[PDB]
Amino acid sequence: QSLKSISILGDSYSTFEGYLQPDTNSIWYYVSPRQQTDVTSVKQTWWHKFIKENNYRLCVNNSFSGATICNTGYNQADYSDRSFITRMDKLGCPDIIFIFGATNDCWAGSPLGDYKYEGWTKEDLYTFRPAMAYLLDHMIDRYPNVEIYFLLNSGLKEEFNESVRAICNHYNIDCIELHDIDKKSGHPSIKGMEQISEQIKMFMRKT
């Protein structure tokens, strides 16, 4: 009888003013938009749409605007305070987790690094492939028997697409490859948010 709940570990694309935990996380989508976007309600987000329309509950949305998977941010800055690998332990007690990241690592120019599936050092976690592997490894152990789905944004560099896809395959994690997402200011529009939700449902109907 009890419906499965979903948490989100995301970035700008999964933020919405007043729905972020911790509440100090940076927001991209406001009720009264700050940037030029047509999205003005949480009901229009990809995650609220998917959760509400597929009979799920909302658990924790730990999304942070401009966050990278790894600890190298924009202009080589240290993003250890806001990275996905730092925030992965605060997602409540969900039944399903969506990971929606890697866009910022792609556009920040974070070093891609080498594939590393164990013995991660502090130096390694400043590069992408070791941080992506460390994320999935630690989350599989932290969230036993929780369904984990990686959402891969459309329009990223192929080196990030292939890295995300290879590391997800290593850990047997489903990687949902988003395509043709309609964007405004490089972020999903109302149409784009609907396309993300319908593409997740397509992937669930196939899998």
Next chain:
Amino acid sequence: QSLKSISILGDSYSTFEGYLQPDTNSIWYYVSPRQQTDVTSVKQTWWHKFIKENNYRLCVNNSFSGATICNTGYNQADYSDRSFITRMDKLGCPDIIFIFGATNDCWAGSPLGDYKYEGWTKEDLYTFRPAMAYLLDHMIDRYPNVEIYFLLNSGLKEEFNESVRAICNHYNIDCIELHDIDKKSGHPSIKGMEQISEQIKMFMRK
């Protein structure tokens, strides 16, 4: 297999010493009573009784003694720190939510205001109908696919009964109208707590 969990967004009637989140919320019911009441145990509360007896789990009880639904309190004081519309975002991750409020808005003499179903300003949420509507609107979005039930106390002014009932109907929220609840010092007694719990079951059953 996994049993549904319940959270409460209440006021004096749903408080019990040591069961409130955040733990800094004002309590009405203490283990050793400080008010004239016969209730001395959490096992006697309407919410513990309903949850335990109908095979549910307890999630979060966010109840605050004397808290109003809107931001106008007793003697026209600003209750923005304790109102239901301020505390509605901290109820854990439940399967069911009970909202049990409007008694303090009724006895504080909070301005009733006009019905407003969008564009709520800071000024509007100091009045009852806009705050009621803002509460249900925001909670439906914050708690998708969570069963929400408004519990309406017995003995309130008809302007508050009718406002609560009209705003619940707008948002398609069940409003359980409590009747003849036995009280001591204006708060449910052991009998009253049992009557609240039995009246919720009969609403569920029908």
Next chain:
Amino acid sequence: QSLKSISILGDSYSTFEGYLQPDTNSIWYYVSPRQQTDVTSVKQTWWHKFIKENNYRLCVNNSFSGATICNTGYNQADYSDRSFITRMDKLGCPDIIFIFGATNDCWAGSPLGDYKYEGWTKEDLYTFRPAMAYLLDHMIDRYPNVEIYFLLNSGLKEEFNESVRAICNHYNIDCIELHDIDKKSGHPSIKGMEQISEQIKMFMRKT
């Protein structure tokens, strides 16, 4: 479809670096061991093993290294800040709770006290039997319809074994009596953690 979640209220034996809530709790098991033990991963702990292998989810692990059930610690120190009866209210919203304590009360030499099933004072809760009853009483009310299991460590003094067993019987709580748990530095080894997990599965099947 939604799987039951489990929370742990433990001591040294249920700790693991990075899996404790609150994160300020004392840890015994580190990734790189500080004490002489062969355990180096959360995957080897009795609780992660049981949860992962019996198709459950992890809720909250509130374990504190060296914490006592009652408020008297080692060398008659006041353990009111870290006792089980102080920490019992912060276990999330689980479907099942494991209580794994009393080892420290046994080796600290905490006063055993008299059996007391009501009217507990601050003075009473410095002794074992009143604190152990206060723990089960308050947790049954705080966690309605949650399955509660007391795990009793092997090799403790019989006065503690018999007290725990009598107080669990009073409150109709299952007391899982662990036997022959393989230990290193007085704490479960990899073998010991597997024996705890298999003995919980065995108890669950016969009850």
